[PDB]
Design a protein around this nucleic acid. Sequence first.
RNA 1: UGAUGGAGGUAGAGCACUGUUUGGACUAGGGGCCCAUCUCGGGUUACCGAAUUCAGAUAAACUCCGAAUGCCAUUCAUUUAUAUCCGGGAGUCAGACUGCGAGUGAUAAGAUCCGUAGUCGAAAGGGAAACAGCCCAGACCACCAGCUAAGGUCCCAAAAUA
RNA 2: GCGGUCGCCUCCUAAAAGGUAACGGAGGCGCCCAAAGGUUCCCUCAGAAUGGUUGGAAAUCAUUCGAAGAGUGUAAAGGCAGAAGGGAGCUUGACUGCGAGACCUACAAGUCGAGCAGGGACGAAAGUCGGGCUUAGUGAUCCGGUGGUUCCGCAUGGAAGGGCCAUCGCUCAACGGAUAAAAGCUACCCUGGGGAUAACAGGCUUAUCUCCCCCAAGAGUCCACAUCGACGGGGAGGUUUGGCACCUCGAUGUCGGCUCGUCGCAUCCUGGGGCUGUAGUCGGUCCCAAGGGUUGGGCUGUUCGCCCAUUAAAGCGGCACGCG
RNA 3: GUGGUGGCGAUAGCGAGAAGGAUACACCUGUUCCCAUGCCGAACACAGAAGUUAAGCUUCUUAGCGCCGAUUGUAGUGAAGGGUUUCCCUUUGUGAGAGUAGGACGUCGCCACG
Lengths: 57, 134, 48, 74
Amino acid sequence: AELKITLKRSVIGRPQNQRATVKALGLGKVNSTVTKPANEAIKGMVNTISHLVDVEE
Amino acid sequence: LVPKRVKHRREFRGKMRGEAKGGKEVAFGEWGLQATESHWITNRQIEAARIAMTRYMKRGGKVWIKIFPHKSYTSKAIGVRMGKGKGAPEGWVSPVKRGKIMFEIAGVPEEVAREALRLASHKLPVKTKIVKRE
Amino acid sequence: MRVNITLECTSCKERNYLTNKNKRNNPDRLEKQKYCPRERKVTLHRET
Amino acid sequence: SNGRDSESKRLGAKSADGQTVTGGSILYRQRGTKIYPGVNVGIGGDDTLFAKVDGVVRFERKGRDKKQVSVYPV
RNA sequence: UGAUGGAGGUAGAGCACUGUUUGGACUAGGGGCCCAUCUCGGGUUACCGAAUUCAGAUAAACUCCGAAUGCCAUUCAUUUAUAUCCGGGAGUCAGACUGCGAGUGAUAAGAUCCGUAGUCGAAAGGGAAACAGCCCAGACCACCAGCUAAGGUCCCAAAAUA
RNA sequence: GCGGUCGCCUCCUAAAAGGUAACGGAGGCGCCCAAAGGUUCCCUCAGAAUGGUUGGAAAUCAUUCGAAGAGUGUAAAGGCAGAAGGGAGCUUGACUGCGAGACCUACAAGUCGAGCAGGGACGAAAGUCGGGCUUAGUGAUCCGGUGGUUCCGCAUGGAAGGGCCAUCGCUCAACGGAUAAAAGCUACCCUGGGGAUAACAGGCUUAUCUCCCCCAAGAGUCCACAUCGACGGGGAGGUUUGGCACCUCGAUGUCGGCUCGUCGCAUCCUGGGGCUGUAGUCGGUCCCAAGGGUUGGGCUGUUCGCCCAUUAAAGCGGCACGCG
RNA sequence: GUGGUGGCGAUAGCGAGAAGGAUACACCUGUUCCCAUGCCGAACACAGAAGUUAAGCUUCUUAGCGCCGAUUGUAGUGAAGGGUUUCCCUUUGUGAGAGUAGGACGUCGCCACG
Ligand SMILES: [K+]
Ligand SMILES: [K+]
Ligand SMILES: [K+]
Ligand SMILES: [K+]
Ligand SMILES: [K+]
Ligand SMILES: [Mg+2]
Ligand SMILES: [Mg+2]
Ligand SMILES: [Mg+2]
Ligand SMILES: [Mg+2]
Ligand SMILES: [Mg+2]
Ligand SMILES: [Mg+2]
Ligand SMILES: [Mg+2]
Ligand SMILES: [Mg+2]
Ligand SMILES: [Mg+2]
Ligand SMILES: [Mg+2]
Ligand SMILES: [Mg+2]
Ligand SMILES: [Mg+2]
Ligand SMILES: [Mg+2]
Ligand SMILES: [Mg+2]
Ligand SMILES: [Mg+2]
Ligand SMILES: [Mg+2]
Ligand SMILES: [Mg+2]
Ligand SMILES: [Mg+2]
Ligand SMILES: [Mg+2]
Ligand SMILES: [Mg+2]
Ligand SMILES: [Mg+2]
Ligand SMILES: [Mg+2]
């Protein structure tokens, strides 16, 4: 099923790939909720920035 | 100790992270001197330790030096500004990683071996210890 | 000794080709069968 | 002295596997045939590989331990 | 970002080539000593020892091998929205530090030179006592409202003498 | 500043695409070949062992072993034994006009190129051939020279003189080349700028310097450790010689001495103590101790240093080598 | 069954050993001619069919050599951190080389003849 995503750690000092994962998911300011499907692409992005993010089923 | 011929006079200092490929267990002798830290070791150190071990052994037994100074190392004369090339080779050196055995000994009782290796350890810069073969 | 050389069509007296040669190894005046685009045939081109 | 070197020449692959490409293109510059030519591919004076017709680039092992380039059109 | 397929010989590892190298068996060959001397054939210091072989090592300019990453591409997928071309206008060509990868260096320098990422520069704010460059974090404004980050909770000085 | 370098090629550095710097490490080029090219056909090397005459360690012959350990014109890298290596025939494609499209690229340039047309080489034919095994063997424009041209020709015809095409002349090597043509002194110097750039002092570092310590072979009649202490190793300090050029060039005053001192202790004397190869006096060494004291002259601008003569003693350093 | 001819990373190979020639392939007998050997009819080429398959060539055995090759585990390493920061450690993920277990003395086809 879909997953909720929230930034919990800033994009400052973090590389462009992580910053672009955030822009692509569609998140801006921290503590920003977004909802996505459980695709392998988005799970890979979440594994790319797991330290930056909290998630929910 | 010196290498009699070399393909390139000057070399890189290199790096020393990680344990040693080989020389990691005692092979020819009964006891040996294991390095617990990685460091450069020179001609003078090797020869001093060898002479120490031999004298305390009273030319008994046999000693084996596993390392060899393949690498060189340069320096600039005091008063020389940086640049204008690379310095002249001062001496010769062996990069000895941790886990390496440097000296092996056999043909000599155990206490004599331990004490000779103790002496050589005090002569070397590395923090060392004793190893025995099965 | 080794010299850069203009060949020449013996008929048209047109140079048409640039090449190289020794004088030691190739002292005699070099010759070839080369194309003269002014005649649109093949012709004896002789060094000059 | 030692302080000199030449212009680095931009060897290696230039077209990728699974990539459609024009004819006359260039696929792999090289000095010496570190990869051989194959189907619909030529080779220049400087051992450079070029596709003679359109198609997708495909690199293949030429048996055990030599490589090949091929261009299968559509 | 995922999946797929490729190029590539790096860290690592290894000795299969190129070099360096330890010990041992054997030894061409090279030393003397003596007998024999036309100086001709030996016999030994467990004399020095090519070469072969056993075992052990070693490498930026060695590789039988060989990653993680990164790179190129897919009328492939997902999510976002910036890429291209034309033309106007610029400024910038003194860069600094921190972390990782290398060189020079004395594997010293807040040293020098590159790569890579970040920050400063051009960025306030909170912590590091103070402290461009470190850690957290991006000031549109107001609020005598709240939840947290790093960092902290005996007093200075808010929070546990938990 | 000298040295070295400036253009081009190869490797490493270069961090498994490409690219990537240094006064970083190593080497080369400024050509050669008329066959060292093309094609057709054929062949496969190096070394070792064995044997054999001069003939040896080793020429040449023969067999076997032999996967490349050879050779590839020339550097290194890559690659090549289906050959690019080697040999023999026939030739000259080391052709002309071109060239889709790609690579690299700031620009100028550079690289590869199927394919078309003409006219050919080789080969029975397929088919290969627009130089070599791949990458260096090179340089603008201007200016002149040579040959050709169906181009132009100051009113006309010509001519002079220009253009187009082919090509020659540049270690213009400081190799994107200032001019066709060019060395020096300045302490008589002046301007404009700079801590972007030298330096004292300062700072970072501490190779070096000083001091301290570890191992302990040995010397010490014997006895390693009273006292010394080889070869070797490890640290502290920030007084030495250095390195870096961060501050200071819209001022930075340069050494020594004088006057005044102040601080540290790695203590020169005095004070305390242990060990002694300390009989006693003198001492040697080490630990504690910085309270006070720690000279006057000759020589030199001198610090230092030597000397004279005393002293209980004639300390070592820092404070912008203290203080203009 | 033999011969020819192709593809698959030699898992195909190299060595050793056994047998066979029915056709076949081969050796083999020669130089008459096309043609050839920096010398040679050895090789090339041509013609033939007395003899033997001894060899080569086929089929079988062999794990000696070489080739392939796991699993586990490790090193290394991307990302995120920590430390006492020329280095070391932790979480997660990937993951060699070596050393092996083991495989492997071939697989797939086409054609001619028997
Ligand atoms: K030590
Ligand atoms: K920024
Ligand atoms: K500055
Ligand atoms: K100044
Ligand atoms: K003053
Ligand atoms: Mg060429
Ligand atoms: Mg390595
Ligand atoms: Mg870090
Ligand atoms: Mg700096
Ligand atoms: Mg950096
Ligand atoms: Mg600015
Ligand atoms: Mg700030
Ligand atoms: Mg400011
Ligand atoms: Mg709260
Ligand atoms: Mg409080
Ligand atoms: Mg690269
Ligand atoms: Mg006229
Ligand atoms: Mg007129
Ligand atoms: Mg220039
Ligand atoms: Mg002035
Ligand atoms: Mg400055
Ligand atoms: Mg002022
Ligand atoms: Mg004291
Ligand atoms: Mg006086
Ligand atoms: Mg007087
Ligand atoms: Mg002063
Ligand atoms: Mg494996």
